[PDB]
PDB file of C-alpha atoms in Angstrom:
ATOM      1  CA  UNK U   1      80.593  49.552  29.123  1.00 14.18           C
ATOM      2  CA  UNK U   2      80.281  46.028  29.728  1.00 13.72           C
ATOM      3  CA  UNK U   3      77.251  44.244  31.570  1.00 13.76           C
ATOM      4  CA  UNK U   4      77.555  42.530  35.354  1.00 14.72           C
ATOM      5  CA  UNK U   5      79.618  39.515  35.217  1.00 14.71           C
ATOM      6  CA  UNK U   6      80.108  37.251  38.331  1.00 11.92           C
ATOM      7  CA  UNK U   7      83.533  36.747  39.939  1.00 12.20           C
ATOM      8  CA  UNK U   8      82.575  34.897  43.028  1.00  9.47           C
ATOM      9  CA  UNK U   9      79.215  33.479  43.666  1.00  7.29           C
ATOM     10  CA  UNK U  10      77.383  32.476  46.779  1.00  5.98           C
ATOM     11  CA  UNK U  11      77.563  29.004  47.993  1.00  4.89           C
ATOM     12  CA  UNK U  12      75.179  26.874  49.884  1.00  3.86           C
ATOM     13  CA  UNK U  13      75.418  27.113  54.289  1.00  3.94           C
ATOM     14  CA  UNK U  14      74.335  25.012  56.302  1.00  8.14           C
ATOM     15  CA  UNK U  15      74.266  26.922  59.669  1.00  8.56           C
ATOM     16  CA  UNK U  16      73.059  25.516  63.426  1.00  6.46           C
ATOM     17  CA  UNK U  17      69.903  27.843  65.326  1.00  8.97           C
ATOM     18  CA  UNK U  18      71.345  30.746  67.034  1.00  5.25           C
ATOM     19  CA  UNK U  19      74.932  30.794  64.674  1.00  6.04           C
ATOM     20  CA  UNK U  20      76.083  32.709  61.783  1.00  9.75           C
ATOM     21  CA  UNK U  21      76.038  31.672  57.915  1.00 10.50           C
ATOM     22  CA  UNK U  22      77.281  34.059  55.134  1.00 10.42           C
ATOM     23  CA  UNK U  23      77.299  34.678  51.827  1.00 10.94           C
ATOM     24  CA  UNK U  24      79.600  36.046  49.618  1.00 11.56           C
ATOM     25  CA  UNK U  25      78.444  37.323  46.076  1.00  6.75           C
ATOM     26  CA  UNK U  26      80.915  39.328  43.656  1.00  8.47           C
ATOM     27  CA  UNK U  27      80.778  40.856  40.313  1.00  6.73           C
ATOM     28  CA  UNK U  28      82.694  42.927  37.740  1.00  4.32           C
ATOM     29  CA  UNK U  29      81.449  45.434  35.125  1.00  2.84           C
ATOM     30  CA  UNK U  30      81.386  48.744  33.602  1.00  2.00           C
ATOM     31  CA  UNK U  31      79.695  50.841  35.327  1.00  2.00           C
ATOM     32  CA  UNK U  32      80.357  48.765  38.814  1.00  2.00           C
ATOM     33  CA  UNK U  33      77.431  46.506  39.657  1.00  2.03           C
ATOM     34  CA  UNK U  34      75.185  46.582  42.567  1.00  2.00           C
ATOM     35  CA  UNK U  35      74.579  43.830  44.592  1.00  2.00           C
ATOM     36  CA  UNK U  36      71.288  42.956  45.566  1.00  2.00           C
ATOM     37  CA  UNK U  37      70.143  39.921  48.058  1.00  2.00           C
ATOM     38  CA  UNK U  38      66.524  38.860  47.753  1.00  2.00           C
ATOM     39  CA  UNK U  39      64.867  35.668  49.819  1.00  2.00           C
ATOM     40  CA  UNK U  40      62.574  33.970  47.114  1.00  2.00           C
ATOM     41  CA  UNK U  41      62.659  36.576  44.910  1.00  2.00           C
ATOM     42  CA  UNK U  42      62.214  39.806  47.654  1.00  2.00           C
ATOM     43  CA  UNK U  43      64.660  42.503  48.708  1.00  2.00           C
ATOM     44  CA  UNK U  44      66.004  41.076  52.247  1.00  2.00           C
ATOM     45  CA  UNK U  45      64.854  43.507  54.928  1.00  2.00           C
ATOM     46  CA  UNK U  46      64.960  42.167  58.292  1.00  2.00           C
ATOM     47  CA  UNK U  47      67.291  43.142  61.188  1.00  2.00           C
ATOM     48  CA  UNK U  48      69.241  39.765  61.564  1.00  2.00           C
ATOM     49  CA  UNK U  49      70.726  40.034  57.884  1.00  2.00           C
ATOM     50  CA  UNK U  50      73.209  42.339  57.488  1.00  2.00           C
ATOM     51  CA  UNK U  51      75.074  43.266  54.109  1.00  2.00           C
ATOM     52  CA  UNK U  52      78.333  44.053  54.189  1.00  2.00           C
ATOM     53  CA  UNK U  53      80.307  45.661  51.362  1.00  2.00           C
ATOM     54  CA  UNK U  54      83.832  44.537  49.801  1.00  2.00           C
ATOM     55  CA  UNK U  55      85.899  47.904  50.367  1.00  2.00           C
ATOM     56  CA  UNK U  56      87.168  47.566  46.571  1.00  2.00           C
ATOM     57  CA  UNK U  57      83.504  47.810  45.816  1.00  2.00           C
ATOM     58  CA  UNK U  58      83.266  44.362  43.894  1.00  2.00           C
ATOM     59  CA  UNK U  59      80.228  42.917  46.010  1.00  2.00           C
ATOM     60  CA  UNK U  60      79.163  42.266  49.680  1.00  2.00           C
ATOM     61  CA  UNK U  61      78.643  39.556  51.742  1.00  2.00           C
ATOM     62  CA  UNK U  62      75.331  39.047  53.426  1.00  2.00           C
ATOM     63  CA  UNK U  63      75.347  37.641  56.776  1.00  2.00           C
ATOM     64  CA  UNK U  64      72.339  36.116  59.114  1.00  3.63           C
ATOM     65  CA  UNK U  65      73.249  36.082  62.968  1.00  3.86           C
ATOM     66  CA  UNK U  66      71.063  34.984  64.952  1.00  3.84           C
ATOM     67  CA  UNK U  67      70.154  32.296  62.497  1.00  2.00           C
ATOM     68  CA  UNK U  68      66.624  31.277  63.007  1.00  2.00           C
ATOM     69  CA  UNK U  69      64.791  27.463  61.764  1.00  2.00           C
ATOM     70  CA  UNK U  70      62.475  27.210  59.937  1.00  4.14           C
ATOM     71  CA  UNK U  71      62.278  30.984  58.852  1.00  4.32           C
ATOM     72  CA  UNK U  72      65.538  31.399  57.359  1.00  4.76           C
ATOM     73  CA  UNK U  73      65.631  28.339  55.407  1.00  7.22           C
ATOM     74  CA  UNK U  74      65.137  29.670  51.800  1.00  8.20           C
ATOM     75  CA  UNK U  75      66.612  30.015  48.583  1.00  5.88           C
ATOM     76  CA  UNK U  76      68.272  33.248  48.418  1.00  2.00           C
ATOM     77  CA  UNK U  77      69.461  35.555  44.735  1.00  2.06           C
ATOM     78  CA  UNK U  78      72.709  37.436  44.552  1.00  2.00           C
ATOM     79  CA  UNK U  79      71.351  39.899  41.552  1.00  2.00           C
ATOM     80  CA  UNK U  80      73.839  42.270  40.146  1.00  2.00           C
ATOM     81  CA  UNK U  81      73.248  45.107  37.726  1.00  2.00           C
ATOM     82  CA  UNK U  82      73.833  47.650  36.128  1.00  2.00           C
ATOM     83  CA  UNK U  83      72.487  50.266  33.154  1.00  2.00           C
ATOM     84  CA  UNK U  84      73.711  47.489  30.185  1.00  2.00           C
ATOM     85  CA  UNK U  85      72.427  44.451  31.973  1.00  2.00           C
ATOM     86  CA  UNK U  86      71.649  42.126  34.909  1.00  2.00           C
ATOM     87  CA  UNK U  87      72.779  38.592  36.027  1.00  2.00           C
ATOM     88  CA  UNK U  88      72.299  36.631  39.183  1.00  2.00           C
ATOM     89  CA  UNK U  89      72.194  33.059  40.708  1.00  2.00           C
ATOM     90  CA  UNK U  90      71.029  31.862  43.848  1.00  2.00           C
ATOM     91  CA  UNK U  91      71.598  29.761  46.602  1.00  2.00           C
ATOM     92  CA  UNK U  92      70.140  27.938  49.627  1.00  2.00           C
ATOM     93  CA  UNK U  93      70.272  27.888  53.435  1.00  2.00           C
ATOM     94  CA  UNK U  94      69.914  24.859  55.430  1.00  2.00           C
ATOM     95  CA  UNK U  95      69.513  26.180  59.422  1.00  2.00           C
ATOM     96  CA  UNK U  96      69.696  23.117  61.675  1.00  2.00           C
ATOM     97  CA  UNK U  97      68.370  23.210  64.993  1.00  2.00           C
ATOM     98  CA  UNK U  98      70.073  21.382  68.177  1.00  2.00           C
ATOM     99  CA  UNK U  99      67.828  18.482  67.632  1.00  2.00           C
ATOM    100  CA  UNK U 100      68.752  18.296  64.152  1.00  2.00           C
ATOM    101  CA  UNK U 101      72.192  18.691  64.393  1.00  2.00           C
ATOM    102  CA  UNK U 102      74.598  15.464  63.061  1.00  2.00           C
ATOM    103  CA  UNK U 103      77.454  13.706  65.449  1.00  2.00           C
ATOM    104  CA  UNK U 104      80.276  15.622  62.698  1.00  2.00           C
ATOM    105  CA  UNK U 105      78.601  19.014  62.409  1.00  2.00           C
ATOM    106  CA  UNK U 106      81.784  21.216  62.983  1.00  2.00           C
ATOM    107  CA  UNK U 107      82.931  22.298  66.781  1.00  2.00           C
ATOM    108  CA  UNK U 108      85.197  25.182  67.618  1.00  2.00           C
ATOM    109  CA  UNK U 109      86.995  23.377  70.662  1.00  2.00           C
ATOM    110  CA  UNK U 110      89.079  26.180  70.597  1.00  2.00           C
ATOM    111  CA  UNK U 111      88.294  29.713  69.046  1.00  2.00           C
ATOM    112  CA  UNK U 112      90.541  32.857  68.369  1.00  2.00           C
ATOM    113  CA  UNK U 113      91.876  34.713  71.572  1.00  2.00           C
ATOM    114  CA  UNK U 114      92.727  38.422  71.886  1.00  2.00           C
ATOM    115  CA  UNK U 115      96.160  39.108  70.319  1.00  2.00           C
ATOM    116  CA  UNK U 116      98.470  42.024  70.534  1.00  2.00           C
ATOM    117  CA  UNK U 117     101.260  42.082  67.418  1.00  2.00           C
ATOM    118  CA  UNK U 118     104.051  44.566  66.950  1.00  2.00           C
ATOM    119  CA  UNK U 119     103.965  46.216  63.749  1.00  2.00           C
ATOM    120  CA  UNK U 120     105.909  44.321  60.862  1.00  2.00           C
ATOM    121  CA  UNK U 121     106.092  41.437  63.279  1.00  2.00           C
ATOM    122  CA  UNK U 122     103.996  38.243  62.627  1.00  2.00           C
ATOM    123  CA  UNK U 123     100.623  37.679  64.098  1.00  2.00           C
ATOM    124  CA  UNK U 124      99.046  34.598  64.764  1.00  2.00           C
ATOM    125  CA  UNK U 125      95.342  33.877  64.916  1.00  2.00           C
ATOM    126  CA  UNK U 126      94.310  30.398  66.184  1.00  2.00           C
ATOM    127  CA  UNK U 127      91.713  27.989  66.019  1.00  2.00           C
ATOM    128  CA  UNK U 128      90.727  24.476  67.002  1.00  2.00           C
ATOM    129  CA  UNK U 129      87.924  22.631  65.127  1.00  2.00           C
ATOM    130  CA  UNK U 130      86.908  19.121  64.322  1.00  2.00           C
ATOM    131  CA  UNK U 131      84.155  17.594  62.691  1.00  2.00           C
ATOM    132  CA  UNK U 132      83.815  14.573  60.696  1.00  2.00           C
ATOM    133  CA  UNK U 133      84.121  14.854  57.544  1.00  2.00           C
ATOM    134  CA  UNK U 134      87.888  17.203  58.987  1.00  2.00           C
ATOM    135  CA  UNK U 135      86.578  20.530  58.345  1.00  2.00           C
ATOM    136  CA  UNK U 136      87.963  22.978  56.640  1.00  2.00           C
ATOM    137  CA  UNK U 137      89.079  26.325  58.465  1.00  2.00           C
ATOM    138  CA  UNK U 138      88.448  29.677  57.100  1.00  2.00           C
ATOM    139  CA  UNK U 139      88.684  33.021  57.947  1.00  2.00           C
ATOM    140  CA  UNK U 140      86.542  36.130  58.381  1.00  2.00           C
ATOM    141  CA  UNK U 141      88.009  39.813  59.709  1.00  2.00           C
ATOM    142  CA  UNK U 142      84.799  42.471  59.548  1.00  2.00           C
ATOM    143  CA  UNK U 143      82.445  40.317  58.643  1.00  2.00           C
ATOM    144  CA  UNK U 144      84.582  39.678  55.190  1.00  2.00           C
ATOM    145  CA  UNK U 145      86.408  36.814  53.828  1.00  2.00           C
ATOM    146  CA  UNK U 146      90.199  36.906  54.479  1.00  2.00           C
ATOM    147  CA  UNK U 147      91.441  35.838  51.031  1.00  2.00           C
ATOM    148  CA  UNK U 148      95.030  34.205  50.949  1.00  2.00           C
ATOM    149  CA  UNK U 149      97.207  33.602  47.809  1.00  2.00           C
ATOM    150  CA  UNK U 150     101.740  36.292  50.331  1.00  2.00           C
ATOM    151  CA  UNK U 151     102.100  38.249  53.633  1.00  2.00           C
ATOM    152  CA  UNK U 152      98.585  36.861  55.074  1.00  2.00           C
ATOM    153  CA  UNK U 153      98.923  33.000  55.045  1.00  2.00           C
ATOM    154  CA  UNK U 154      96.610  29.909  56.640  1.00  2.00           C
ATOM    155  CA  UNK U 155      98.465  27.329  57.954  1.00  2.00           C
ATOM    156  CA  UNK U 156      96.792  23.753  59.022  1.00  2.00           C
ATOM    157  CA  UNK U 157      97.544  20.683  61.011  1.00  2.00           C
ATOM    158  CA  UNK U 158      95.180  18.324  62.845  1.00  2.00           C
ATOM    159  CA  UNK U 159      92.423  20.261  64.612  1.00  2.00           C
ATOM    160  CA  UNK U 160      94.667  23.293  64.675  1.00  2.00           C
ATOM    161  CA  UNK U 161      93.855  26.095  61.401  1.00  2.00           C
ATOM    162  CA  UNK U 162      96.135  29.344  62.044  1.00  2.00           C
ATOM    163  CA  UNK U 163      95.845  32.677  60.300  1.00  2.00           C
ATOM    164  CA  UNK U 164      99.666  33.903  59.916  1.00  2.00           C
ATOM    165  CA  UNK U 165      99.956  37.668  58.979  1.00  2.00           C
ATOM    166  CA  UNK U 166     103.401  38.608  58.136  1.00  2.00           C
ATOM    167  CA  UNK U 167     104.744  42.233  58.434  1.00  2.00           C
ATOM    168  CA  UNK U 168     101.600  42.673  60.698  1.00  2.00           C
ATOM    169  CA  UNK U 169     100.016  46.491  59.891  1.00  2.00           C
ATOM    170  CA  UNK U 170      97.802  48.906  61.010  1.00  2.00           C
ATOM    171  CA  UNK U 171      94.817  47.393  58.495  1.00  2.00           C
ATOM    172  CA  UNK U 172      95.305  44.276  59.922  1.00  2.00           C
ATOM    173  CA  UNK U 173      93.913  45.056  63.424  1.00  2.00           C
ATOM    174  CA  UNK U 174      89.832  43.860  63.169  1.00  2.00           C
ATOM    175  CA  UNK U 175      87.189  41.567  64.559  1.00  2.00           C
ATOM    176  CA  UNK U 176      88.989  37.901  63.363  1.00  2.00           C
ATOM    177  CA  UNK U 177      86.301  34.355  63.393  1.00  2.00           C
ATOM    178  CA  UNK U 178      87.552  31.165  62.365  1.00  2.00           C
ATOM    179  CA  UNK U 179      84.807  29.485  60.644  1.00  2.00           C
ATOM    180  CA  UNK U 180      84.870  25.512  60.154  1.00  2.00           C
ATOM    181  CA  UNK U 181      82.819  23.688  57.386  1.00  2.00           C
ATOM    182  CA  UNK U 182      82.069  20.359  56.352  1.00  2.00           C
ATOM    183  CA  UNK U 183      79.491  18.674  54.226  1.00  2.00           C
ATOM    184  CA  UNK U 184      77.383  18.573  57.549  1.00  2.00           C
ATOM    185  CA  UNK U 185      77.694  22.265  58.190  1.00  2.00           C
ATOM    186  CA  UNK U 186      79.102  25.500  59.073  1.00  2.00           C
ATOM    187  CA  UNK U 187      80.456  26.482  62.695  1.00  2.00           C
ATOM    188  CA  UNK U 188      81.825  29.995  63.685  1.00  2.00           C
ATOM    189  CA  UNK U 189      83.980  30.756  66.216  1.00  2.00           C
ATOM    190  CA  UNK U 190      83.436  34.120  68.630  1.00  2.00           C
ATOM    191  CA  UNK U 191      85.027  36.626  67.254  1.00  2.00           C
ATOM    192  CA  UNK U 192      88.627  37.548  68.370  1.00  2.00           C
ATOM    193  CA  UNK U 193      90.194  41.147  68.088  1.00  2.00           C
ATOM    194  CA  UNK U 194      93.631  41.458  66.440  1.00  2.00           C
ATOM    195  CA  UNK U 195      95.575  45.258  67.745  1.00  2.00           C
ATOM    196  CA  UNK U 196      98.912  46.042  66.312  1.00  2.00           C
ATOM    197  CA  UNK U 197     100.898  47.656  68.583  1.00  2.00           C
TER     198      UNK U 197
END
């Protein structure tokens, strides 16, 4: 038995009124952690945050949508535990209004569209962002991180981030965002489904 460890810990959003921010907070230990999110110090327990669990069981990922300003700005905990011991670290949200928000805060001038793959064929999820500083384009399918490094690649050029998945599969179909971030901000996309045919 060992105690909760932390593989991947939650790093500071920056999200715009009305958006989405998440969170993502893993662990590793023996027996498996649990993951609990608290907002200065408290269980979270409102409608608008929503934890979602890793399927492998490692952690969750706890996601605001609507965001809200001023209430959701607030340091929140990632604690995981279990019977030989307990870690966790924190981190903060920033929730800009429209009024607030700077002239490089990410846009989506293009988000993911409805695609149909054949099975073992490649699918192709797109999306256009810009921003200044360039954002960076991620990816989230289910309200989870798509982690990549390889059948499921990111590709990137200009404005344009694409989500290649190789030898497309049945697991693959899902609810796909793009999600560009800066050091002004965070920016999601509407959420495009992926079918495999």
């Amino acid at each position: 038995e060992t105690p909760p460890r932390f593989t991947r810990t939650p790093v500071d959003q920056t999200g715009v009124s009305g958006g989405v921010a998440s969170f993502i907070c893993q662990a590793t230990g023996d027996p498996r952690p649990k993951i609990v999110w608290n907002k200065k110090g408290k269980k979270v327990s409102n409608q608008r945050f929503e934890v979602i669990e890793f399927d492998d069981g490692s952690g969750s990922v706890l996601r605001i949508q609507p965001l809200r300003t001023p209430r959701d700005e607030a340091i929140y905990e990632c604690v995981a535990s279990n019977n030989v011991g307990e870690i966790s670290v924190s981190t903060r949200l920033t929730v800009l209004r429209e009024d607030q928000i700077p002239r490089g805060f990410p846009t989506i001038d293009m988000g993911p569209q409805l695609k149909v793959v054949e099975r073992t064929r490649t699918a192709t999820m797109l999306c256009a962002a810009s921003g200044n500083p360039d954002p960076e384009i991620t990816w989230f399918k289910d309200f989870l991180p798509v982690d990549t490094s390889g059948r499921i690649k990111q590709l990137r050029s200009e404005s344009i981030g694409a989500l290649q998945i190789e030898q497309s599969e049945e697991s693959d179909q899902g609810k796909y965002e793009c999600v560009a971030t800066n050091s002004a901000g965070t920016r999601y996309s509407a959420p495009a489904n992926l079918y495999v045919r």
